[model samples]
Target: GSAQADFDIPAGPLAPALAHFGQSAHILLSYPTALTEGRSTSGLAGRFDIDQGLAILLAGTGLEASRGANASYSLQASASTG
Candidate 1:
């Protein structure tokens, strides 16, 4: 069987403008990727935490941490940075 969770990240004051520029200014989730696109993806090595000032992962829901065969990681959480 599989597991899941839910949560929320209070919208920071910088969310709107970031979205307008087609990018997420706040580091909600960060990881080193294999695609080399300079963006986070499904499988990557990094950290997930809210209120950490970098990649803030929401709280409340169960955040499932996983790693891929390529040594990458996958964060399954209810909410993430905006």
Candidate 2:
């Protein structure tokens, strides 16, 4: 989708923020409990593309987003390299 939405998510828990983002951007997101537990977002506040919005939301959360086959998104914990 080539649409944009303005967001003003406050800094706090992750799940609610993700939910807000998903609803606001009209995108589907899939995430594992292990990836989201104990996680929080710095939050996003801007007009952005859905993908870019998701990227901003995931920043600093130790997580990453992937585009799925059905125009959906999947979130997972990022791997640390030694």
* Strongest candidate by lDDT: 2
Alpha-carbon runs more than 4 Å astray in model 1: 1-61, 79-82
Q: Tens digit of lDDT per residue, candidate 2, span 6-78?
A: 7667765566666777677766677666656666775766789767777777666766777665647777665
As a TM-score, model 2 comes out at 0.74
For each candidate, what is the lDDT?
0.26, 0.66
Tell me the tens digit of each residue's lDDT in model 1 across 4-79. 1222323322232112111222223223232222222121112322222122321222233343343233444333
Best model number under TM-score:
2
TM-score of each: 0.21, 0.74
The residue pairs that clash in candidate 2, if any, are none
Q: How far is candidate 2 from the true structure (C-alpha RMSD, Å)?
A: 3.4
Worst 10 residues of 2 by lDDT: 73-82
Q: lDDT for model 1, on a 0 to 1 scale?
A: 0.26
